[model samples]
Target: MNYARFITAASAARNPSPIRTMTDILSSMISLAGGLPNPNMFPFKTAVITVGKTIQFGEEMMKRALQYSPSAGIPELLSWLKQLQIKLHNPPTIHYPPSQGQMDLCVTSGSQQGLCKVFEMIINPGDNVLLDEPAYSGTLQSLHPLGCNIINVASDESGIVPDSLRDILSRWKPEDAKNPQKNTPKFLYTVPNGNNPTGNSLTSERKKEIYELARKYDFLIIEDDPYYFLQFNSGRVPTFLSMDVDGRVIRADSFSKIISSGLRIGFLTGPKPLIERVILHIQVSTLHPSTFNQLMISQLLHEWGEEGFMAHVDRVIDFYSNQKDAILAAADKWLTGLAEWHVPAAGMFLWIKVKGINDVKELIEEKAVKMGVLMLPGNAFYVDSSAPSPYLRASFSSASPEQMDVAFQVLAQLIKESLLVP
Candidate 1:
């Protein structure tokens, strides 16, 4: 279905962003393009955050927090985040100075907003988009309304299968496709670290192969990795961004999971040109994320410093790793014979395959909820939600061990009941 007709002429046209273009010029020849408000008029000059009974703040920091910030982001905060990115991913190329062929960062109100802006910047009506099978529902929700021909690439316990990607891209002919809008996909959207719903993280070897495929297919990769810091293993896994050699990967990172979700702060790192386009969308949409939120995070980063920040990350990992174990134990005791699941290497979800139940959606709606436990049906994570799916996703992030036991026990009982039925 073509949605181009619904979009206004102005919206459909691929025009240069006046804000970004002017903002760039203003950086060198500053006059009044910003028309920014006076910081003096802003109320609340001071703010503080307490972590484990320790208050952290400063006078200068409070001023920055309360004032409106540059659209790109506060310079110091961006610089700090850039260093953190370097320490973490160490991408081959980066362009902090915004020169030709450099990678840059764009601050966003959570990674979801980054995803939204990415779609707005890159996708047009009728464009084809490749996604991991059982892709993130939030991504699906955002893409569905855009009228893109969503092509599902197959995936496994280790995340997206390289062969399936090659098979699809090799065979993909826009004109040959059933959907009239089908064209070469603009990009592949994936959650490389601890994929949502599936809870599968891609291996380094798999990432290299996938990156090669992206290079061959001439499509960008959207690496949405909110759970990168949540890996349960010995060492950190290499992200698609870490291996991006050709500036083909646009990565979105969030503070929601690692920090506080309510903060609604995230950042995007990618080619400067791509990020500039996203910034244009941001200028009109939210005009940068919460000023105070960004300031608070920067202050927190400074207070914790590099070592302290990483130590906190380590604690988060330990907490979730322990949670993963508890959930797996519960599943072993209750869901072992009734359903199948792989231990998630990272992230909060456990992707379970309930044996013999072709569509867990109907079962969850009709039986599972009535039995007092709720889980997301597998189909909810698929590109086509109506399709039959044996899987369901459960999160161990907040549920207590006893609650996990009851939930899976109820799930097991529901499956047994379904099996016994006529």
Candidate 2:
């Protein structure tokens, strides 16, 4: 792939700063070329974290936490996450020299920052980009300000439809997008494993089909998979990275659902150059992901080896599965005739469509809230927010089983009354 064609002019022109080269301090021969505040001056002398275990932060560890670390990541955490990525997605394992750009990984403040950095790097203003319909609002928020043109494709319970992607990519026969100026999209962004708002898994067959489309179109794919750990099925699904032979997938992962979201820790894996492109943004904007937060998560993961980690994943899966069942039952009882929905295969949200109602925005936003029930209107999920929609998003994460039943009751009444409106 001609990667340079996708990179923005600003990022392609960026050069490594001299500070990275000069920080060596002249072979440590008593040269003073570095600037770092003495650790003694830090406010705290010691700290401890109770990440389900009494992890100690004595003088040695405290100093590391209080100080600025690498723009990439804490070496220990970076190594751990790299191993995790390799185990999760072998990624072709190409036998290439270093300059040929093998896979690379970097941690982020959250997957959101990593995602936005990639957008800023590759998507110039007015550039065309493909997005799945009923997308994640957070993603739309990021791209909305970038002023890129969002060309949307269709999706169903199986996630992105291959025919839909092919129809979009084959328009004018971009010849696989060699000449990008023909308004061929730079890339496609879609949720994987479980979509946000929609709560549907990307079917394995569909994923393969989408990957093939990316290859045929010679475009990139951004797999923002935050709910990979929340599967209700027998086991986890394969990620876009697992089949990335051409270094065409930039996968952003999140620990928000499985661990503490306040930890604000996630990672990005992709072609070394693009990962580094995001890192340059990290260096300039965030300086780095929080060192203290990184260390906290690092200690917890080490304490729970991959085996232990999977055990916890099983537990989380069980909990969400139970939660999903409750809402499923509640909707079955109270909303069967009033509303319609699909079983949420994974993730926190349940997408519901009110029966016989073409538009539910005002009913949900203005009326349902007054009835002590709340759900995000579906129109907000689309690129064009003004359009009417029959769908609403209900979360099954924190609400109690009784609350789920009552919430649906309120919804049924709201639907019943709205239909009676003259």
Candidate 3:
């Protein structure tokens, strides 16, 4: 049937790091490549309110567990999630339940799974898609197989620049590209808060500007905002979804960070019809997300209520906040004068650049890795792998204090030696 190439070209071709390949490589490699959080500092332990010292999982919880739930999700969980919608800059209210949770919130295996499914719904073969210069590699990975034409939208600390975005849009217009199919991008993608590799949160003003640009350009926005909750900087952060007056924003989120990655639970909030299409796709792919897990999270959130969940979130944010501070301090102590970088305002990462280094991948391959510290090449995050970058990504969320110190030290030494006359 030659279905293999069709499916391969359908979803896997654009993926930069297929899970198996990355895992195998990291097994042999001393890596700073993956964006995994530390297990030791997980905050759910603190949030375990007890019947005596633990919250009771009663018969209602068991009923939710044993039953086959809707493809959309449990009704109770969907309602609670609507509250989350209200909390996140006030989205529209749905008077009646559609196919999914509210007019949004299509629960899935995880945000990444949600992404893969949504792309299937939105992108056609050979469609053009726009992404941040240093993007979430996972998204880049997903779009590759659809044979979609990729575009890069430049970003500053304030998120994507409107002017810069306009330039790219203009450049990729039908008159400019030889292929008419490549003219208009199907979507402009971003991780507005705590961006995966860069960790920069978009200020409210910047998000407003982006919303305006999306309106002007007539483009859909893929708001890939899994880290939306972890802002550490001094500023009013807003969501792209918040300013999306048009139905252009589809936001993917996860309980992986808040709860556990092992659960493999995530959701996407988008225009109702679009999210419904994704739900249909998901139903065909996995039937339904584990009813048990959804119920457990629902029960937990219901019992904990808004106040308790937020309290736990605050604690989690504090842990990342401190870790970010530590890494920034180390950078200040070690690489401040020697390098140049845009300090992150949120999440558990810092995207740093050594001054005058042209090929970060080569430098990491030869110098940084050999010196006993490693980081993902800044170029790894780009949609166009050929693009040049001096940046390096480091995560404070996962590394131990000792590993963090040594990693920075070795990284600093590599910089010193690389710039030396030898």
Candidate 4:
């Protein structure tokens, strides 16, 4: 008998992120790495007490929560979701979602899991995953293992440009012995509003143009918008969801920033078939999202209703907004011209770009953390690993008011020390 050998070409590319690899180096190192929310701000105490009884029914909810839910999602949760979507001003008629790819809404443990599931369903090994330069590091880390070619498109304060987007797609080519796969870029991912690392939000006109480009190029747009509600400037900034006339957008919304990350609640809204595919992938791998989380959030929605939830959201928004202003003020007093930034229009972060610094990672590890000022390096957000930037992401949502001032001072000192006086 003869034995045959088969191996997937993309198998070797699967690996963990460099950030994780540097975990120990960053451990006693005092993190600005994970971008996690401070537990002090969590509303558990208020939520538990104020939570209505209708939500905390007998063991029915408990049992449902403890067990698996429908692959599409829990029926009650889905019903509440339809109403929830309507309030968000999304399309109506979301009665019953599908089972596999392109479905309207699919449940996931969280947006992170949702994104990973999307990759597994759609991306073949070695497929090019187009990303804006300085993309979300978590997303970059997740896709890195698929052996997918990541092509970085140039972006500025406004986010990805349509002309550049089209140019990239028009000129794309696959990597092979011919050269490299730098040009065969496929899917395009953008945070649109409240982006990590950059804190840049795209204009409505820009989003419209991106939609047009996707139509022409026929590439999927992953609108990973976790910070949809965490934004400071909602009235001014337009979401990619707002510009989806052709149904080319796949958006993942999160309760992580607004509610709690530990709850692991997130929902994906997109075309019917694609969403179903994602759901199918979820079914086989992780089954349904946490039934308990879904029920709890649903109950919260039911008790609070839209107005109450909005009020609660305003409290959260105001908290982050105030913190953002405080940090900006601190930056002004401490950094001034030394640190450059666009005051965040939407999210909780102040995306500051320091002039003249080459690689701040070493300096961050050496001086910033030692001085008790922590900031996430700009490079951590990039997908290419080649582009040079001096950007840093500081969360206004986490650090306390007192800590904000100290962190700002420490940051200013670190920058001043790194620079050479003429």
Q: Identify the candidate with maximal TM-score.
A: 2
TM-score of 3: 0.80
True lDDT of residue 69, candidate 1: 71
User: Mind sharing the TM-score for model 4?
Assistant: 0.80
Which lDDT tens digits does candidate 4 get at residues 1-422? Answer: 00000112232233434443565364234566644455344333222325534455453444445654576677776777656665674542244333222227766788998888777655666676777867778898988887778877777788887777777777743322133334244457889877787787777888778877765655667889888777777574656655555555678888888887898888888767566566666656676787667878887787887888889889988898888888888888887888788777678778887877877777676788777677788878876565666777888888887788888777777778789665
Error of 3 at 109 (Å): 1.1
Q: Candidate 1 on 243-273: residue-level lDDT in tens?
A: 8777777899999999999989899998776
TM agreement with the true structure for every prediction? 0.88, 0.96, 0.80, 0.80
Model 4: CA > 4 A from native: 1-55, 92-103, 172-185, 234-238, 386-389
Which candidate number has the best lDDT?
A: 2
Better of 3 and 4 by lDDT: 3
Off by over 4 Å in 1: 1-45, 52-63, 95-100, 172-182
- What global local distance difference test value does model 3 have? 0.70
Judge candidate 3 at residue 320 and give its lDDT: 88
Off by over 4 Å in 2: 24-31, 93-95, 174-176
Candidate 2 TM-score over all chains jointly: 0.96
